[PDB]
Amino acid sequence: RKITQGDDLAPGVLKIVKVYLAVKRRIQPGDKMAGRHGNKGVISKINPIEDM
Amino acid sequence: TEFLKPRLVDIEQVSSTHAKVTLEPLERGFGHTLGNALRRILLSSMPGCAVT
Amino acid sequence: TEFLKPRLVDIEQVSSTHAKVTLEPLERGFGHTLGNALRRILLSSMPGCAVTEVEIDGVLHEYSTKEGVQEDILEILLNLKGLAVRVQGKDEVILTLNKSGIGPVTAADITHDGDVEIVKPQHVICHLTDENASISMRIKVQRGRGYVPASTRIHSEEDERPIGRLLVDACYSPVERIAYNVEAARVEQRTDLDKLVIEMETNGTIDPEEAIRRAATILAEQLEAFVDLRDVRQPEVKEEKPEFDPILLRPVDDLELTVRSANCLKAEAIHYIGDLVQRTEVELLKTPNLGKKSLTEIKDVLASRGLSLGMRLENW
Numbered sequence: 001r002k003i004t005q006g007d008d009l010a011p012g013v014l015k016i017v018k019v020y021l022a023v024k025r026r027i028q029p030g031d032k033m034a035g036r037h038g039n040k041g042v043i044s045k046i047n048p049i050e051d052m
Numbered sequence: 053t054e055f056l057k058p059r060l061v062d063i064e065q066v067s068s069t070h071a072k073v074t075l076e077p078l079e080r081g082f083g084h085t086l087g088n089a090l091r092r093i094l095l096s097s098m099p100g101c102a103v104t
Numbered sequence: 105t106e107f108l109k110p111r112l113v114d115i116e117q118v119s120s121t122h123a124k125v126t127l128e129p130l131e132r133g134f135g136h137t138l139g140n141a142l143r144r145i146l147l148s149s150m151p152g153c154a155v156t157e158v159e160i161d162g163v164l165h166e167y168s169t170k171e172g173v174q175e176d177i178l179e180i181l182l183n184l185k186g187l188a189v190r191v192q193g194k195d196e197v198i199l200t201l202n203k204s205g206i207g208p209v210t211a212a213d214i215t216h217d218g219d220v221e222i223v224k225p226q227h228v229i230c231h232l233t234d235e236n237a238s239i240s241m242r243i244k245v246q247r248g249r250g251y252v253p254a255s256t257r258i259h260s261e262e263d264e265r266p267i268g269r270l271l272v273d274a275c276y277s278p279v280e281r282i283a284y285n286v287e288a289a290r291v292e293q294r295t296d297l298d299k300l301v302i303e304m305e306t307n308g309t310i311d312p313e314e315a316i317r318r319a320a321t322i323l324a325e326q327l328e329a330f331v332d333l334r335d336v337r338q339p340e341v342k343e344e345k346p347e348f349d350p351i352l353l354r355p356v357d358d359l360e361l362t363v364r365s366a367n368c369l370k371a372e373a374i375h376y377i378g379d380l381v382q383r384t385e386v387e388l389l390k391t392p393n394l395g396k397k398s399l400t401e402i403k404d405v406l407a408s409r410g411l412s413l414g415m416r417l418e419n420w
Contacts, residue, residue: 049140050088055322056336058329075329079149079322086326089141097131 054079115313120223121306123313128299129289135300139284141323148251150319152278152309153188156196157244158270166270170239174231184229185273187211188309191247192219199243205235214243223308248276278309279319343420345378351411352378352420361405368394381406381415 009016027043034040056077064072075086116124127135162170169176191197197220203213211227232239252274255261265271282304289297304312317324346353354377356369372391374380380402388399406413 048084048088049143050092050137055325057332058326059333059335060330061333061335082144082322085141085144085322089137089323090326092137096133 117311117313120311121308122304123311124302125313126299126301128287128291129294129297130300131297133298135286135298139300139302142320143282145322146279146282146304146319147277149249149322150251150277150279151247151249152276152307153190153245153247154252154274154276155185155187155243155272156246156248156274157242158272159242159268160270161238161240164268172233172237173239174233180230184227185275186307187222187224187227188276188278188307189223189245190221190309191245192221195248196244196246199245201229201239201241201243203232203240204238206232206237209239220245244272246274246276248274251275251277251280278307279304280307281305346376346420352376352381354378356380358409359405360408361401362398364393365398365401368392368398377406378420381411381413382417385413 027046029043029045031043032041033043054077058075058077060073060075062072062074062076064074066072075083078086113128114126116126118124163177166178166181168178197218199220200215201209201213202215203209208231209229211222211225214222216222216225230239254271254273257263261271285301285303287299287301288295289299302312306312355375356366356377358377368391369380372388372394374383385399385402388394388402402413
């Protein structure tokens with residue numbers, strides 16, 4: 001009964017509802033990268049292993 | 053299977069020195085493998101003849 | 105025509121899941137780049153083995169737990185799904201976990217006296233707590249193909265799977281890890297060419313000295329691709345419908361035919377005999393329950409009208 005607990009939601013609200021999302025924000029271009037020594041910048045293409 | 057015996061169907065010449073040269077169909081993006089692995093073959097051990 | 109297709113070369117087995125074939129001599133640089141091609145195939149698209157579907161003795165969803173275990177089910181199943189094996193008849197086996205009584209729950213509590221080699225007879229799932237407690241399931245397993253997680257179809261994947269019929273991470277691909285290394289050529293004729301070295305390590309489904317061609321085929325069968333130059337394609341074939349005279353403007357009702365035919369030709373949606381007059385007989389074998397007898401009724405019930413099958417027309 002911290003789950004089955006209720007709380008007032010002020011005069012104007014009988015009930016409230018929620019959902020949470022595990023958003024798998026994958027590796028992609030336009031996203032940002034860096035290293036420890038102050039190099040900071042955008043991922044500007046993904047290259048085949050030989051395109052390198 | 054989708055290695056569908058993918059013959060060089062679409063070549064498009066430009067005049068006795070240059071064509072488009074294309075290879076199809078390919079495995080959900082596999083031109084990324086062939087266009088960098090096989091393109092290195094095309095720069096390794098090739099025919100023709102010249103002054104020495 | 106001056107192909108080379110080399111063979112025979114090397115052996116260095118280490119432990120069932122890793123062996124170390126190597127390649128020399130190589131022409132002037134070949135070993136420096138080629139090991140990056142299989143780095144796609146031996147991850148994405150491979151056949152091998154995985155679990156496909158599961159049904160459980162009191163657990164409708166893996167996002168939960170069962171009142172008698174000592175470990176909890178989502179982060180158990182994350183480890184169970186790696187159980188991948190080998191199969192020796194047709195591709196599939198619906199295995200079973202048969203477990204009851206105190207102690208660990210393992211690959212040694214599973215059905216294994218048939219066409220199957222459970223190469224993981226040391227995998228462990230969880231515990232049980234009393235001499236009459238249980239955990240049991242059906243387990244569909246195939247050799248299959250690909251790196252498929254339990255959501256991949258992404259719609260029609262709401263699908264009506266009877267509540268407890270778990271779809272599973274069918275990651276059939278027996279490798280993700282593959283890489284290579286290089287030397288100078290060392291065959292005692294030479295010190296003057298290059299040499300490839302392999303560091304494949306596996307899902308335990310096979311060893312690197314056990315089998316290979318399908319795992320190199322999206323690089324070997326990528327060669328006919330440049331020669332023998334005949335290819336492949338499909339058409340468009342229909343017209344936009346419909347006008348007088350009402351010889352074609354009729355449902356199957358007008359034909360005087362049998363009831364199972366009238367159920368499966370209803371599923372095949374042929375609600376105007378104006379197109380049953382021109383659909384190919386082989387093209388009626390395109391929905392099940394429509395077999396050798398119903399496919400044979402068509403051949404005179406159309407003619408009985410004073411009509412025929414096989415009557416394409418330039419305007420409908």
